[PDB]
Amino acid sequence: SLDFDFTMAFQPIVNCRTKEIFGYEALVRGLNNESAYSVISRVNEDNRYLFDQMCRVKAIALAAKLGLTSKLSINFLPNAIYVPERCIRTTLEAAKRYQFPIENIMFEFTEAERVEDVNHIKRIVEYYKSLGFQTAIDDFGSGYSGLNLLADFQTNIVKVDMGLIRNIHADQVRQSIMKNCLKLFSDLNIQPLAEGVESHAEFAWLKAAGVELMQGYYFAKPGFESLPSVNPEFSEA
Amino acid sequence: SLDFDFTMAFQPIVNCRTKEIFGYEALVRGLNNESAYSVISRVNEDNRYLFDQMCRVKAIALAAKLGLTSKLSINFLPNAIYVPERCIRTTLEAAKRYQFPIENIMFEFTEAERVEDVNHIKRIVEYYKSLGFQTAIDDFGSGYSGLNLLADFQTNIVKVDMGLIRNIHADQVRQSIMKNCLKLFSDLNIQPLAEGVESHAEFAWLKAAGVELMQGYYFAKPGFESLPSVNPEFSEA
Numbered sequence: 374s375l376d377f378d379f380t381m382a383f384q385p386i387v388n389c390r391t392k393e394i395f396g397y398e399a400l401v402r403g404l405n406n407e408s409a410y411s412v413i414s415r416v417n418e419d420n421r422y423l424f425d426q427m428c429r430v431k432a433i434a435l436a437a438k439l440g441l442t443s444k445l446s447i448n449f450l451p452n453a454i455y456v457p458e459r460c461i462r463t464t465l466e467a468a469k470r471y472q473f474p475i476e477n478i479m480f481e482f483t484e485a486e487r488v489e490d491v492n493h494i495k496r497i498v499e500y501y502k503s504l505g506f507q508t509a510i511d512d513f514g515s516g517y518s519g520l521n522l523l524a525d526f527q528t529n530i531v532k533v534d535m536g537l538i539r540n541i542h543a544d545q546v547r548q549s550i551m552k553n554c555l556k557l558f559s560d561l562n563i564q565p566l567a568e569g570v571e572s573h574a575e576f577a578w579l580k581a582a583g584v585e586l587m588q589g590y591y592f593a594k595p596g597f598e599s600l601p602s603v604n605p606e607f608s609e610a
Numbered sequence: 611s612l613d614f615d616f617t618m619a620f621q622p623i624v625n626c627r628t629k630e631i632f633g634y635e636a637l638v639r640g641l642n643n644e645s646a647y648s649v650i651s652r653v654n655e656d657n658r659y660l661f662d663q664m665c666r667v668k669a670i671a672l673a674a675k676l677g678l679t680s681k682l683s684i685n686f687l688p689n690a691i692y693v694p695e696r697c698i699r700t701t702l703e704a705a706k707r708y709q710f711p712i713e714n715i716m717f718e719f720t721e722a723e724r725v726e727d728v729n730h731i732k733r734i735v736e737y738y739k740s741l742g743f744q745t746a747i748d749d750f751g752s753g754y755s756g757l758n759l760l761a762d763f764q765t766n767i768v769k770v771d772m773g774l775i776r777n778i779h780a781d782q783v784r785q786s787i788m789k790n791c792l793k794l795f796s797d798l799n800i801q802p803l804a805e806g807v808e809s810h811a812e813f814a815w816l817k818a819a820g821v822e823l824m825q826g827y828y829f830a831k832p833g834f835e836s837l838p839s840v841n842p843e844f845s846e847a
């Protein structure tokens with residue numbers, strides 16, 4: 374091992390149908406709640422492996438210590454894809470010691486560099502799948518993560534990038550994109566998740582369109598080393 | 611200025627509904643028909659502007675020389691910096707001197723790098739549209755160019771990346787992507803173009819799916835300094 378230290382924040386994912394917590398996304402934070410990028414910008418090429426392992430262990434240990442009983446979603450470091458199909462060992466043992474079933478752990482994948490890897494990320498997604506992990510395509514529709522990923526493999530979940538959601542209630546173009554992507558997701562039996570929801574107007578539009586899993590400041594900011602509670606305003610029913 | 615020289619190849623775009631030629635895409639070649647990548651890899655940052663200009667004029671002058679009477683589609687260099695809206699003068703002047711109507715010239719845009727200065731490509735696209743040029747999103751559904759582009763601006767055409775077309779007659783995931791993307795394109799009144807069509811089987815499925823404009827080796831490989839004719843096999847089927 375370790376060169377610098379950091380901890381985790383947690384942001385709830387809500388099932389807007391049932392009003393229950395689907396899970397929490399783990400997000401790296403500095404020890405004084407500094408930004409994730411501030412932490413990751415300290416990550417270089419010799420850091421990729423060890424930082425990735427600390428990330429998984431810190432999130433799992435803190436989720437366990439906090440008593441999380443729903444799912445834990447961890448960001449997969451995108452350039453940690455050096456084909457080491459046994460470096461998942463550190464993860465499985467971390468889950469064992471913390472009595473956290475692998476099936477309650479979801480890994481979020483993003484393409485970060487255009488170099489039509491697919492098979493490279495696909496080998497990982499299907500391998501993680503074979504171990505019992507849940508998987509998600511993250512930032513779908515943010516330029517990098519796109520249809521090319523969905524053509525060669527399908528995850529349990531697709532997190533729609535928040536740029537596509539912003540002000541969707543007033544944006545007929547964004548409205549058409551989402552409707553046809555939801556029909557696509559349903560055709561591929563993939564569960565959608567609307568990310569970055571900021572206002573009642575977005576949430577209300579996303580919910581009528583059929584999105585159940587949602588995430589964003591409207592429900593709760595991330596909580597430093599905590600499991601935030603959810604705004605009761607949406608859950609009025 | 612320039613340091614090296616090059617010329618153009620041309621590949622027909624067919625409208626399978628009208629069975630007519632839509633136009634040709636210009637594709638860079640070495641002076642002895644070397645590959646586009648071999649030529650383009652010679653471009654650095656002090657080359658970008660002048661090479662981008664040389665490309666446009668050579669395509670317009672040679673299409674004129676060859677007697678091209680349909681549309682001319684020119685690849686917009688993805689790293690064509692923050693060029694002001696007055697470097698378009700060279701383009702307009704070449705079109706005029708060669709009596710090539712501006713409305714018969716289409717520019718193809720790809721995202722490449724930096725995912726969030728999509729407001730910049732929007733300014734360029736809307737500026738070119740205002741002058742009368744046709745515009746297209748190239749490589750749609752591959753690594754870089756995706757839904758984020760369609761969310762903030764709409765071009766005349768979207769060229770669906772050939773990775774999504776390959777084997778589409780037998781690939782239910784790809785069939786699902788295209789089906790839902792065609793309905794999206796139609797909602798945005800965007801004309802789709804299926805790129806890289808290689809077999810009768812692919813062409814037949816895309817055509818039954820409603821695609822009119824297509825491009826690929828099935829119809830004709832690019833012609834060095836020439837305008838290829840198109841395989842009569844599609845004009846029957």
Ligand SMILES: O=c1nc[nH]c2c1ncn2[C@@H]1O[C@H]2COP(=O)(O)O[C@@H]3[C@H](O)[C@H](n4cnc5c(=O)nc[nH]c54)O[C@@H]3COP(=O)(O)O[C@@H]2[C@@H]1O
Binds near residue numbers: 399409410448589595
């Ligand atoms: O309503 C909202 N309106 C606006 N913004 C909202 C709303 N709701 C949430 N957000 C925000 O969405 C981001 C998290 O989602 P994302 O994964 O797409 O972004 C990246 C990526 O994950 C990476 N990263 C982070 N941690 C790790 C890690 O442990 N291992 C590997 N990579 C890691 O750096 C993240 C950006 O840093 P963050 O600031 O920490 O988080 C933001 C913030 O919470």
Ligand SMILES: O=c1nc[nH]c2c1ncn2[C@@H]1O[C@H]2COP(=O)(O)O[C@@H]3[C@H](O)[C@H](n4cnc5c(=O)nc[nH]c54)O[C@@H]3COP(=O)(O)O[C@@H]2[C@@H]1O
Binds near residue numbers: 636749
């Ligand atoms: O059925 C098929 N099966 C298989 N392959 C098929 C089929 N049909 C077509 N092809 C191929 O598809 C590509 C053309 O389209 P694309 O734009 O996506 O490709 C890039 C890019 O645009 C850029 N480039 C090229 N010229 C310029 C330029 O003037 N200014 C700026 N950038 C320029 O380098 C191009 C690659 O060079 P190429 O090898 O010549 O072209 C290929 C080839 O012909």
Ligand SMILES: [Ca+2]
Binds near residue numbers: 398448481511
């Ligand atoms: Ca994420």
Ligand SMILES: [Ca+2]
Binds near residue numbers: 512
């Ligand atoms: Ca995300």
Ligand SMILES: [Ca+2]
Binds near residue numbers: 685718
């Ligand atoms: Ca092109």
Ligand SMILES: [Ca+2]
Binds near residue numbers: 771
């Ligand atoms: Ca292309």
